[PDB]
Design an enzyme around this catalytic site. Structure first.
Site, short mmCIF file in Angstrom:
data_model
loop_
_atom_site.label_atom_id
_atom_site.label_comp_id
_atom_site.label_asym_id
_atom_site.label_seq_id
_atom_site.Cartn_x
_atom_site.Cartn_y
_atom_site.Cartn_z
NE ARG A 192 0.65 -2.17 3.96
CZ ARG A 192 -0.09 -2.43 4.92
NH1 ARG A 192 0.43 -3.17 6.08
NH2 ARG A 192 -1.51 -2.13 4.90
CG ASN A 193 1.46 2.82 2.63
OD1 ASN A 193 2.30 2.81 1.78
ND2 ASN A 193 0.20 2.14 2.93
CG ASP A 214 -2.85 0.78 2.98
OD1 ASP A 214 -3.02 -0.12 3.54
OD2 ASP A 214 -2.01 0.89 1.96
N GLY A 225 9.74 -2.66 -4.89
CA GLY A 225 8.74 -3.24 -4.05
C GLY A 225 7.31 -3.19 -4.60
CG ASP A 229 1.06 4.54 -1.06
OD1 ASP A 229 1.29 5.42 -2.11
OD2 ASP A 229 2.02 3.42 -0.84
N1 ANP Z 1 8.52 7.41 -2.46
C1 ANP Z 1 9.01 6.09 -2.06
N2 ANP Z 1 10.49 6.15 -2.16
C2 ANP Z 1 11.24 5.18 -1.87
N3 ANP Z 1 10.63 3.79 -1.65
C3 ANP Z 1 9.16 3.85 -1.71
C4 ANP Z 1 8.20 4.99 -2.05
N4 ANP Z 1 7.07 4.51 -2.02
C5 ANP Z 1 7.26 3.40 -1.68
N5 ANP Z 1 8.65 2.72 -1.69
C6 ANP Z 1 8.84 1.37 -1.11
O1 ANP Z 1 8.10 0.43 -2.03
C7 ANP Z 1 7.63 -0.53 -1.10
C8 ANP Z 1 6.19 -0.90 -1.98
O2 ANP Z 1 5.40 0.14 -2.20
P1 ANP Z 1 3.83 -0.07 -2.26
O3 ANP Z 1 3.22 -0.51 -3.48
O4 ANP Z 1 2.94 1.29 -1.62
O5 ANP Z 1 3.29 -1.43 -1.12
P2 ANP Z 1 3.19 -1.42 0.32
O6 ANP Z 1 3.32 0.01 1.02
O7 ANP Z 1 4.46 -1.99 1.10
N6 ANP Z 1 1.53 -2.02 1.02
P3 ANP Z 1 0.47 -1.27 0.42
O8 ANP Z 1 0.61 0.26 0.11
O9 ANP Z 1 -0.37 -1.11 1.83
O10 ANP Z 1 -0.71 -1.88 -0.23
C9 ANP Z 1 7.20 0.20 0.20
O11 ANP Z 1 7.29 -0.73 1.15
C10 ANP Z 1 8.48 1.21 0.33
O12 ANP Z 1 9.58 0.37 0.88
O1 9LL Z 2 1.60 7.42 -5.67
C1 9LL Z 2 1.39 7.06 -4.84
N1 9LL Z 2 2.22 6.43 -4.19
C2 9LL Z 2 3.59 5.93 -4.63
N2 9LL Z 2 4.71 5.07 -4.35
C3 9LL Z 2 5.94 5.33 -5.20
C4 9LL Z 2 5.68 6.35 -6.37
S1 9LL Z 2 4.42 6.96 -6.11
C5 9LL Z 2 -0.16 7.34 -3.92
C6 9LL Z 2 -0.04 8.68 -2.89
C7 9LL Z 2 1.42 9.51 -3.15
C8 9LL Z 2 1.59 10.59 -2.64
F1 9LL Z 2 2.65 11.37 -2.51
C9 9LL Z 2 0.48 10.65 -1.62
C10 9LL Z 2 -0.66 10.16 -1.50
C11 9LL Z 2 -0.89 8.99 -2.37
O2 9LL Z 2 -2.19 8.27 -2.29
N3 9LL Z 2 -1.00 7.57 -5.11
C12 9LL Z 2 -1.57 8.62 -5.45
C13 9LL Z 2 -2.72 8.42 -6.63
C14 9LL Z 2 -3.51 9.21 -7.33
C15 9LL Z 2 -4.55 8.68 -8.45
C16 9LL Z 2 -4.42 6.96 -8.42
C17 9LL Z 2 -3.68 6.14 -7.53
C18 9LL Z 2 -2.97 6.91 -6.51
C19 9LL Z 2 -1.64 6.57 -5.85
O3 9LL Z 2 -1.19 5.41 -5.36
MG MG Z 3 2.41 1.98 0.19
#
Ligand code: ANP
Ligand code: 9LL
Ligand code: MG
Ligand code: ANP
Ligand code: MG
Lengths: 291, 285
Positions: free
Chosen positions: A142-143, A138, A20, A156
């Site tokens: 979804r987060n 945020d 995603g 996030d």
């Molecule tokens: N750590 C993770 N493990 C599994 N799936 C994940 C994880 N992080 C994100 N996803 C999935 O990936 C999708 C897209 O991630 P993301 O880029 O954060 O967009 P979003 O959360 O849907 N919108 P936003 O973060 O508010 O801009 C999420 O909706 C989850 O279903």
């Molecule tokens: O990595 C994140 N999300 C992901 N989704 C799928 C795989 S990693 C996200 C994040 C992860 C977490 F465990 C806790 C808090 C978070 O804010 N961060 C951290 C960060 C640091 C510097 C610049 C950008 C980002 C950024 O996006």
């Molecule tokens: Mg997200």
């Protein structure tokens, strides 16, 4: 401190499936290959969309060390970072995905005890971020990631979603822990509607107008007045009149103790939480952390 | 409540990982009812009353120690299928062979500590392993090993105490003899013990006082421990309690007790890499 953030090499991990995309990057299911080992350990990778410079990497790393420093059962920790042209961020892979998708897919399978426990757990996680003086900015279903159905974690945090934002965030770009409470209110509404889209059919550009006029998200069909009133208190115009995250923990915990009094769900009596047996089985396979 | 009864329809075996004297181990997938996920497990399909099997299976589900693998679920409908956590690193015997140039004293001595901790726990529970060997130590992470397949009695001549060979006596003190062989396996980086000697002759050469040779990397301090595990009088052998203490003592000054070329370079992981390792693979206490 900075020992909580591992700097990864390109060569030690691979993206294998697009999961995603969001406002700042694309998330992949990936595999970590420890140097000199033969195993491939599933991770989640977020590759940012816009490539950055060495100087902008200094900002990125600074925030990366902070997000790697959180220690709470309902808050996701950032695990590693790779400073490629597009920076790649590594965290634990949640195979159940986000709670928004989970509630949509099980909208006929979810009982009151799950929903109310999710709200408690999300409040617990946000309360911790407040203790750390970290503003999420945020929050949304979804987060919220599902580690097991019995255990959700916020992600996030600390980095526009007009329809989740507090009015002062829309109007004045003010983000506090009290605006996060507004986003918590919308998140709870998302869950209780089983993933409906908030203000569906209202242009984002017109949301501040309807809020100033006092219009708010509608009462979910399953929510009693007690639950809806909490959601409404999160959406007060005066940020300091909104409940605190600690109060939300106490209140949803109170309701979770008599879930059927506060949520009215058709068929709620056939869906319950898992037996001690099934939680122990879930924990030994997917979820070994303290709580 | 520690042993989950699984239906055939909620898990699938996908690939054979190996077989031993009691069954075949498969990499499998658990599919929770009403969910869309597939969770990797390890399934051991055996071959030899269901309530009896369950009764012993309940004992194996009840072990609680960071260095002992717990039995998680069971499916008794056809063959007996046992479900436990899948260890992608495999067993410690294979790991030591595959990394026989990267294993330093700090890893080796700490593995001996952990294997003793798990065996000491089994002794507290009065569970006799009967098949301890490096192949029955699973690598959770390189830093964390766990004893498996204890209690599968429901023959490894070259790991057995003499009284087990001659008289079928299995005690915790015969487990000590097998612990001695296991440690020799590690310190030789996975060599086959008494290689080229038929099992039929082991009892004769033990009675004649022959024992496994001193590994090239072992100081006499470490070899003396192994030899004490192989005394003919079971009660003169050390206790797993004592073994924890001595290998812990030695692990505090690892290069004094093991002589490995380039060891001064093969140290335990930095706090960073363990924290990363633990968050991905090893969240337990
Ligand atoms: N750590 C993770 N493990 C599994 N799936 C994940 C994880 N992080 C994100 N996803 C999935 O990936 C999708 C897209 O991630 P993301 O880029 O954060 O967009 P979003 O959360 O849907 N919108 P936003 O973060 O508010 O801009 C999420 O909706 C989850 O279903
Ligand atoms: O990595 C994140 N999300 C992901 N989704 C799928 C795989 S990693 C996200 C994040 C992860 C977490 F465990 C806790 C808090 C978070 O804010 N961060 C951290 C960060 C640091 C510097 C610049 C950008 C980002 C950024 O996006
Ligand atoms: Mg997200
Ligand atoms: N939970 C597990 N995760 C990963 N590999 C495993 C697991 N359990 C067993 N194995 C491997 O599966 C293979 C067969 O195991 P097993 O059937 O117990 O035979 P063995 O231990 O090598 N000989 P035996 O003394 O008869 O048990 C071995 O290579 C083990 O390392
Ligand atoms: Mg085995």
């Amino acid at each position: 401190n900075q020992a909580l953030l591992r700097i990864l090499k390109e060569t030690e991990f691979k993206k294998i499936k697009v999961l995603g995309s969001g406002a700042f990057g694309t998330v992949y299911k990936g595999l970590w290959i420890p140097e000199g080992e033969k195993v491939k350990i599933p991770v989640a990778i977020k590759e940012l969309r816009e490539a950055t410079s060495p100087k902008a990497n200094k900002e990125i790393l600074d925030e990366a060390y902070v997000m790697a420093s959180v220690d709470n059962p309902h808050v996701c920790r950032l695990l590693g970072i790779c400073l490629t042209s597009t920076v790649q961020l590594i965290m634990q892979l949640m195979p159940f995905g986000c709670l928004l998708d989970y509630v949509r897919e099980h909208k006929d399978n979810i009982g009151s005890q799950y929903l109310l426990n999710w709200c408690v757990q999300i409040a617990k996680g946000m309360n911790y971020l407040e203790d750390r003086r970290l503003v999420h900015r945020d929050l949304a279903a979804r987060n919220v990631l599902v580690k097991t159905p019995q255990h959700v974690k916020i992600t996030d945090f600390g980095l526009v979603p007009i329809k989740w934002m507090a009015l002062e965030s829309i109007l004045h770009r003010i983000y506090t822990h009290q605006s996060d409470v507004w986003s918590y209110g919308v998140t709870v509404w998302e869950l209780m509607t089983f993933g409906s889209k908030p203000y569906d059919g209202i242009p984002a550009s017109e949301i501040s107008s309807i809020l100033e006029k006092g219009e708010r998200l509608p009462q979910p069909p399953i929510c009693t007045i007690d639950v809806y009133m909490i959601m409404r208190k999160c959406w007060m115009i005066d940020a300091d009149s909104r409940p605190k995250f600690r109060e939300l923990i106490i209140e949803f915990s109170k309701m979770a103790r008599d879930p059927q009094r506060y949520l009215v769900i058709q068929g709620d009596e056939r869906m319950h939480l898992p037996s001690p047996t099934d939680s122990n089985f879930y924990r030994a396979l997917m979820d070994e952390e303290d709580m």
